[PDB]
Each structure stands twice: as structure tokens, then as C-alpha cells.
Amino acid sequence: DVRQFMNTTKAETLLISNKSIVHEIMFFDNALQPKMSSDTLALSEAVYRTIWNSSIITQRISARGLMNLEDARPPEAKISHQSELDMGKIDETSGE
Amino acid sequence: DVRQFMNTTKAETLLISNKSIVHEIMFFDNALQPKMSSDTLALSEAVY
Secondary structure, X not given: OHHHOOOOOOOXXXXXXXXXXXXXXXXXXXXXXXXXXOOOOOOOOOOOOOOXXXXXXXXXXXXXXXXXXXXXXXXXXXXXXXXXXXXXXXXXXXXX | XXXXXXXXXXXXXXXXXXXXXXXXXXXXXOOOOOOOOOOXXXXXOOOX
């Protein structure tokens, strides 16, 4: 949400805390970057980042990106896992 | 000048003339078309 992505905490504060308070951090994804028009001059200065999640933080991502950057499947788009679209019978006694 | 390119004469008039009058015609070039962003859906109908 490049329009509405904040920068909540600078790292100078993740080293000052009572070790028992959970911060909240806003990660920004851009893996589905369109390849801009073949007119713009390539950039000259990049963007930095400091924090890095040490483990997996994506269990609640059903789908990432509905685009078509080349009018086909974007080579890193993620459709949902077949596990979450199962409709099996129920034991007629206790739902479940 | 896609912004300011007219369409002066339709061909139905280049066949009606006294053979001695010079028309003026505006040709439009676009050979240096940028290849637009790899996001837009390819077009469906061309230009004649």
C-alpha cells in the first residue's frame, strides 16, 4: 500500500524495551512490481531496509496479486493452498 | 503530435478535384513509440 505504508519504529528503539512488550511492525511487500514503461530513466539511488523477519510470517496470505504483468501468470503470484478449499462430508452426529 | 494531429481530408474528396489543385495533407509519424508499461492489457482493435 505504498500510498498508506507507515514507518512505525526506527531501530534505535527496538534495542530499548523491557523485553516483554510486543511491538507491532508494518511490513511492506512489493514483489509484484510492474516493469515500468521503457521510457523512464533508470533510477540512481536505492532504498534501504534494516529489519528482517527471522521466521515465517505468512500463514494468513490466501492470495498475493491478481495482476497479469505479461498477460499471463506473474512468475511469483500465489494462489491459495488446496487445503483451505476442501468441502468434505460431516459426520451426521456432531457436525465436525 | 498525437495531441494536435488533424485528419484534414477523407479520401472521398481526393477523387473529386480539377487535377490542378494541390491539397495539403498532415502525415502522422509514431515510429518512436515507447513500449508501454508491462501492466496494460494489450489492445483489441487497431487503427486503419
